Amino acid sequence: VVKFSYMWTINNFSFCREKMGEVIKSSTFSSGANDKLKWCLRVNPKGLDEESKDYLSLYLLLVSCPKSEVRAKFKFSILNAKGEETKAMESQRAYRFVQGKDWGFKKFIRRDFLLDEANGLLPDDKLTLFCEVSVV
């Protein structure tokens, strides 16, 4: 099992112009180890489709060309203003990735819950995501 974690911040989140189905992309990161597989995270600030229009969507994508099908479990969390993990969603098992394949959660968090300052999920209008992946 190859375990790797990535912390990424989206600045000025309440200012994001992406309409439904449009994507904010993280930097490309790496699972290190043997194969140096490359990955990215993709965020739909206003959902992926009309079914998810009230939600932020979050997906893990395999960027590089693997030598074979990759199986990975993943967990996505939001880091709150105090720095603690909250609002986690995790895959119940490993999912199968090829180059260009994404897996994630179309309904990761409700937008209005996310934007409410009383919930402490956007300190200084920054959304910090914490992605943990185990390639099995």
């Binding site: 119940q92 994404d102 897996w103 994630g104 959660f105």
Partner: peptide
């Protein structure tokens, strides 16, 4: 349950 945007 995770979902994908792909075949």
């Amino acid at each position: 349950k995770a979902d994908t945007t792909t075949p």
